[PDB]
Amino acid sequence: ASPFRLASAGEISEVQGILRTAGLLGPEKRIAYLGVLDPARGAGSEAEDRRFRVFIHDVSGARPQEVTVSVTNGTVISAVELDTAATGELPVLEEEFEVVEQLLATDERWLKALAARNLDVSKVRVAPLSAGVFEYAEERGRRILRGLAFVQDFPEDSAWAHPVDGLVAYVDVVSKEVTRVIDTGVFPVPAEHGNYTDPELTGPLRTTQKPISITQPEGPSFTVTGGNHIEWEKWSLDVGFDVREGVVLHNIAFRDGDRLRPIINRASIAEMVVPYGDPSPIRSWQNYFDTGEYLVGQYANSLELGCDCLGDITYLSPVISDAFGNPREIRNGICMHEEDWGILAKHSDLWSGINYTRRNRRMVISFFTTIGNYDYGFYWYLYLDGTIEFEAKATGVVFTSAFPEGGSDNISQLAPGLGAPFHQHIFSARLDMAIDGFTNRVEEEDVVRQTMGPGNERGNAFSRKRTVLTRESEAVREADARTGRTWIISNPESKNRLNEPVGYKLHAHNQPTLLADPGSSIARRAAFATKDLWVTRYADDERYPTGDFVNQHSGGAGLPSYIAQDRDIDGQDIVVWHTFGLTHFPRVEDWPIMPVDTVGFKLRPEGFFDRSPVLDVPAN
Amino acid sequence: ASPFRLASAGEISEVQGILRTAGLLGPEKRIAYLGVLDPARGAGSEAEDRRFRVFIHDVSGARPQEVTVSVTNGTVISAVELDTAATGELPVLEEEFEVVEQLLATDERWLKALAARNLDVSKVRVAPLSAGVFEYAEERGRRILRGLAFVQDFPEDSAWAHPVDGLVAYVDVVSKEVTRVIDTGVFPVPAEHGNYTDPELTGPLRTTQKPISITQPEGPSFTVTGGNHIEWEKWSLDVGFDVREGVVLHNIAFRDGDRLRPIINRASIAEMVVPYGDPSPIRSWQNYFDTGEYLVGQYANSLELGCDCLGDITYLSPVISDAFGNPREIRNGICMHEEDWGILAKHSDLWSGINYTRRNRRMVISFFTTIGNYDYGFYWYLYLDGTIEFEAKATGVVFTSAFPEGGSDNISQLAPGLGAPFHQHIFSARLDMAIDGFTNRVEEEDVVRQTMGPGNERGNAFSRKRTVLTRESEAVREADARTGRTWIISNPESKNRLNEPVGYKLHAHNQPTLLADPGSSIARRAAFATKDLWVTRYADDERYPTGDFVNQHSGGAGLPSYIAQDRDIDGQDIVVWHTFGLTHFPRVEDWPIMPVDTVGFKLRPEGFFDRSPVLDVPAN
Ligand SMILES: [Cu+2]
Ligand SMILES: [Cu+2]
Ligand SMILES: [K+]
Ligand SMILES: [K+]
Ligand code: NA
Ligand code: NA
């Protein structure tokens, strides 16, 4: 019944059949992206129409297509041929990654570079990375990956310990040609291993950790219906999954007495960029768009009970398409559980004699993905008190290089001769807002300091100000931690009992945004990452801050193009795009495998309720 | 046998006996503060001298004294008379708070003000608050409290729902005289009750929360020896308790191989100030120094198992002195336990085939205190990966006023006619550093953006810079979130295997600092709160950022005075004082009892270790 249910294997197979029937999926075609579309605005009024969007690649080099299918009706809604040099290449195919090492292994230039370094080609792994857009005119309209080399000494060796600096190659993964091999000079390949399961390196394992047992003897407090509809402690939502974005939350709402009150229509991480800050030509092109170029959902891990997710866990196993349109399940790819969260509210009152304490808890929805050396966890939290929070967890093995003799301003040393280039991990959260419905606006709120003088003779007063963002031209905003800057999303047509528009306040971490020079390729391609907050008017085709096709795509799409429309956002259907990230100067403690570091944001109700929403929580 | 052990009931009784015998504790004497002194530098050689520091007030108006006694040898080490008009008044006595309501109840001016408002005097509670120093010359050298009125309709009613605005009184708590009653005009007393245990207000309690059971079938992984010495997962420390500061951590060190490596010599919250930003003369003097004026440890709650602290809990029950020198135990006042903390490190490697996941945990040491309407939780965390973290949790009932007709730039509305004046809660963490020993220095680290051009042709490079703080005149620093500013404490004479000084990096939340005008009384008395980071040279007598006697001190005491010495801090025994706080514009959701909100900071190792310190953690 629910139009927000997860895609099923049968739906994916049926999309395959519809595409085949339409002549759009012959043997040379590959599915580079496939996902269910959300129901149209106002659609609830009518019957089910489950539509899927597909990006179809052609291994013969013919132009690819973007296609929308109605699986319900068995029809192709639209099919358009793409000019990729203009609008962007399709996301990288899992099958294209392996091409790189294979092709390089028989290239005379590559072999000569390896021989100069006394390296056995059979032991050289190649990290096949996205190419971006630089000065190589021959790449325009071609699907390129760039390869960086790492030595793997034996089958279970961590190759990341042994970067081969001074060497990079470019490969056309459709024509299967090595277009360039660049060798700027030999660097020693760091010899120390980074094998974090080798007893020689770990030493004797700790015997001091006693078990922590977390159980729910009566089961969890949330219910799951229709496969992915969650109800928990007044909250209601649907947990979606998309191969590009990963976990997507739909219809986040809170049951306040008799009213189901919407808060956020759709929440997702709509892009993530990982830009490298080492000016060496070996890596100066290196920027991952894990969401837009790689598709983070497709690399979601299967999460193990007791290790990845502890306690009473309810799993979802989302289905995605493989390269041929066949369904494949990611078993136990999404964890759902509730966690104790310490004290909720507490007061010991002298005058009344009443001592009161209540405990907090949060609902958790999470998944974990692996992109080469890096592993990222995506966690959404709902709290009893109405707070909504997202947290990203970064771990894995840091990307390495040689450490230059004489040091570096752009690389840190992890081990003898082993460097780790500086980089960032920057996320964009797309929050399609629906505070008490779709009529919303955003205000920027700053603390206001006041001068000592008349009306403030003791110089103690302080205040705040709010500025409504009325049009998209006014809605590209930056952090100001010093002035406690936040952004409030409110509904000017829905008032609380004190006659104030109901709202939610976004609290950012105020981490640095994109550091690259504004004239760089990456600043143009990751324009969203240069500012902390953007507000747009909702539109069906405005899904990602980087546009539909990010791979080898220049500036020209995404948020800067959307904002130019200068639409009314003052009491309208709006979308907040929040940039937030980590700036990583790797430390020795990050090696040989990195302890988790985190970044995120939260929203708290701001006069959304008529009083605390947790007065009906019982004593523990 | 450890000099860092908690005070025994007998030790306190011994101080009482020494004082009495010495003629220093007659019938008019009151103990306003009593605490054990830490060992002086390098004293681990000589045999111990357990010394206690005592502030003695005199209720007949005789001059107070600061006294040091040795319980080991049964002697008075020193007794010095204080000129309070010069150096500040002693902390407020619980017995002086009680004087205010009693005295006002028979004052004609107070009765006249209540009669105009038709309020039964027997129902009027008075919040007796610290006075500060303003324009009243007659207050110098006198102990004053200022009282604000709240109506309590019946014994179990929350009086905070019913503030009596336009009225304030000043009381001399020694001469027991009402020095002033100020009535600026009647404001309606808000009528709605704020009784969060009344079913009429809570509605039917939720029956939807199923149990979360946290147990440790083999007990906890930490050991407690000598009463308060903790060993857990490589960490070593002593948990102290002081009536002023509350929980204090001593000798935080980490066992790296066969070496016990010091990190922090002493960690405490050395002050916390709650300044109000409402320019009404009814409240414009209102600033709580919860630590310095009230003494937070004195009001520490007894914590209930299953309620306040969940799981396998080990309690400390610290002893403090009452006003007459008798020992009083705070039963179950400190919670100690370890918590699961999600994923520690994770990587799924394609090339090696090895899938690796480890879980994190943290040691928690916490207490909760109640200051009138407010309740604060203080939490220290030690993580497996070497991270040290502090978190304050703010809850309780917000301080209220009338909400003016026409609104307010300095007060928010919580309920009909009920206001909540704007205010801050600002903490000072005093960290007596000992990174690999006492020879330390601090560097300020900023991200450095780079311009596209020669050496950076693609404009992707970024870097960072570090500035050593060499002298105290250079060591008063502010946040810069935009530039990712942090501070590193290192030991220039202890290097890791890569030949870099070992260090720890402090990560601030970058919340706003003190908002008051720089010329205000509060900016002078709480100067520490105006800047994010201070570094001083260690000195025995430099304990609090606001000085020893905060109550009614005119200003300039503490950090500003210490810093003025301009001592060498470059490779010396130094102390870091971090200011961090919440700026609170109360929301409707904070009423009638406030859901917890939080603030804090953390420090992470920065090349302190030679590689990840958690490679020896076993699989779950
Ligand atoms: Cu990183
Ligand atoms: Cu507050
Ligand atoms: K059909
Ligand atoms: K003795
Ligand atoms: Na919207
Ligand atoms: Na020190």
Joined together, the tokens standing for residue B479 give 């946040």
Helix (H) or strand (E) run with residue A261 in it: strand A259-275
Residue (of A159, A158, A100) closest to A124 by Cα position: A159
CB A292 within 8 A of CB A274: no
Joined together, the tokens standing for residue B351 give 């090339």
Residue B245 CA to residue B428 CA, distance in Å, equals 11
CATH number for the segment(s) B1-87: 3.10.450.40
Residue in B with minimal Cα distance to A376: B346
β-partners of residue B391 are B379, B600
CB B574 within 8 A of CB B433: yes
Q: Which of A307, A483, A500 sits opposite B512 (nearest CB)?
A: A483
CB A454 within 8 A of CB A464: no
Q: Is the peptide bond before B605 cis (omega within 30 degrees of 0)?
A: no
Q: Which of B308, B459, B511 sits opposite A357 (nearest CB)?
A: B308
How much of chain B is in helix, strand and coil states, percent to nearest 5? 15, 45, 45
B506/chain A closest Cα distance in angstroms: 14
Within its chain, how far is the Cα of B327 from the centroid? 23
**CA B171 → CA A216, A344, B45, distances in Å?**
55, 37, 50
Residue (of A208, A212, A505) closest to A340 by Cα position: A212
**CA A495 → CA A491, A498, B12, B407, distances in Å?**
8, 7, 58, 16
Backbone angles phi, psi at B590, to 5 degrees: -75, -10
The pairs formed by B81-87 with CB atoms below 8 angstroms and a separation of 24 or more are B82/B549, B83/B141, B84/B141, B84/B549, B84/B552, B85/B140, B85/B141, B87/B548, B87/B549, B87/B553
CB B498 within 8 A of CB B517: no
CB B545 within 8 A of CB B560: no
A289 is in an annotated binding site: yes
CATH 2.70.98.20 domain locations along chain A: 196-619
Joined together, the tokens standing for residue B265 give 């010599």
CB-based contacts of B110: which residues, under 8 Å, 6+ apart?
A: B104, B169, B178, B181
Q: Residue by residue, what is the 3-state secondary structure of B185-209?
A: CCCCCCCCCCCCCCHHHHCCCCCCC
Count the helices and strands in chain B (H runs, E runs): 7, 34
CB A532 within 8 A of CB A477: yes
Residue A186 CA to residue B128 CA, distance in Å, equals 75
In this complex, do B593 and A356 lie within 8 Å of one another by their Cβ atoms?
yes
CB A523 within 8 A of CB A466: no
* Side chain identity at residue A199, one-letter code: P
Joined together, the tokens standing for residue B378 give 């203080």
CB-based contacts of B558: which residues, under 8 Å, 6+ apart?
A: B271, B527, B528, B544, B545, B546, B547
- B94-195 under CATH 3.40.109.10, yes or no: no
Residue (of A443, A277, A385, A366) closest to A600 by Cα position: A366
CB A378 within 8 A of CB A246: yes
A473/chain B closest Cα distance in angstroms: 23
Joined together, the tokens standing for residue A346 give 């507490």
CA distance between the termini of chain B: 38
Joined together, the tokens standing for residue A322 give 């493989």
CB B596 within 8 A of CB B395: yes
Ligand (nearest to CA of B375) = 2
Q: Which of A155, A158, A201 sits opposite B615 (nearest CB)?
A: A201
CB A168 within 8 A of CB A150: no
* Side chain identity at residue A247, one-letter code: V
CB A33 within 8 A of CB A15: no
Residue B135 CB coordination number (10 Å): 9
Helix (H) or strand (E) run with residue A20 in it: helix A9-21
Pairing type for strands B411-415 and B418-421 reads: antiparallel
**CA B580 → CA A128, A490, B276, B392, B422, distances in Å?**
45, 29, 16, 10, 17
Residue A281 CA to residue A262 CA, distance in Å, equals 50
Instruction: Answer yes or no: A290 catalytic.
Output: yes
A297 is in an annotated binding site: yes
Pick the CATH number of B196-619 from 2.40.37.10, 3.40.50.700, 2.60.120.560, 2.70.98.20: 2.70.98.20
A294 is in an annotated binding site: yes
B297 is in an annotated binding site: yes
What residues of B are in contact with residue A284 (Cβ under 8 Å)?
A: 457-458, 460-461
CA angle, corner A555, sides to A553 and A559, nearest 5? Answer: 110
* Side chain identity at residue B81, one-letter code: E
* Side chain identity at residue B255, one-letter code: R
* Side chain identity at residue B292, one-letter code: G
Q: Residue by residue, what is the 3-state secondary structure of A200-246?
A: HHHCCCCCCCCCCEEECCCCCCCEEECCCEEEECCEEEEEEEECCCE
Question: In the Cβ-directed half-sphere of B266, how many Cα atoms lie within 13 Å?
Answer: 28
CB A528 within 8 A of CB A545: yes
DSSP letters, B486-500, are EEEEEEEEEE-TTS-
Q: Catalytic amino acids of B?
A: 290, 374
Helix (H) or strand (E) run with residue A399 in it: none
Residue A297 CA to residue A312 CA, distance in Å, equals 24
CB-based contacts of B47: which residues, under 8 Å, 6+ apart?
A: none
Joined together, the tokens standing for residue B347 give 């990587």
Rg value, chain B, Cα: 26
Tokens 């006249």, residue located: B112
Residue A93 CA to residue A89 CA, distance in Å, equals 11
Ligand (nearest to CA of A438) = 5
Residue B539 CB coordination number (10 Å): 12
B394/chain A closest Cα distance in angstroms: 9
B311 is in an annotated binding site: no
DSSP state of A294: I
Residue B338 CA to residue A212 CA, distance in Å, equals 9
Tokens 């109901």, residue located: A502
CB A488 within 8 A of CB A481: no
Residue A577 CA to residue A475 CA, distance in Å, equals 10
Residue B79 CA to residue A211 CA, distance in Å, equals 53
The dihedral through the CA atoms of A512, A515, A519, A523 has a sign that is: negative
In this complex, do B596 and A212 lie within 8 Å of one another by their Cβ atoms?
no
CATH 3.10.450.40 domain locations along chain A: 1-87, 94-195
Q: Give me the torsion for CA of B317, B320, B326, B328, rounded to 10°.
A: -30
Residue B19 CA to residue B75 CA, distance in Å, equals 9
Q: Which residues of A434-472 are buried (b: 16+ CB within 10 A; e: fewer)?
A: bbbebbbbbbbbbbebbebeeebebbbbbbbeeeebeeb
What residues of B are in contact with residue A375 (Cβ under 8 Å)?
A: 346-348
**CA B214 → CA A220, B393, B505, distances in Å?**
14, 22, 33
Residue A382 CA to residue A369 CA, distance in Å, equals 22
What length is written for chain A? Answer: 620
**CA B348 → CA A247, A375, A446, B165, distances in Å?**
20, 8, 43, 63
A569/chain B closest Cα distance in angstroms: 25
β-partners of residue B34 are B54
Joined together, the tokens standing for residue B468 give 């050593």
Q: What's the B212 CA to ligand 1 centre distance in angstroms?
A: 35
Residue A515 CB coordination number (10 Å): 27
Residue B454 CB coordination number (10 Å): 6
Instruction: Answer yes or no: A374 catalytic.
Output: yes
CB-based contacts of A115: which residues, under 8 Å, 6+ apart?
A: none
Residue A507 CA to residue A545 CA, distance in Å, equals 20
CB A376 within 8 A of CB A568: no
Question: What resolution in angstroms, rounded to 1 decimal?
Answer: 1.5
* Side chain identity at residue B88, one-letter code: G
CA distance between the termini of chain A: 37
Q: What's the A18 CA to ligand 3 centre distance in angstroms?
A: 8
Lay out the sheet containing B75-81: strands in order across: B29-36, B51-58, B65-70, B75-81
Joined together, the tokens standing for residue B520 give 């205000």
In this complex, do A368 and B377 lie within 8 Å of one another by their Cβ atoms?
no
* Side chain identity at residue A97, one-letter code: F
In a mutational test of the A interface, the residue from B611, B614, B617 whose CB has the highest number of chain A CBs within 10 Å is B611
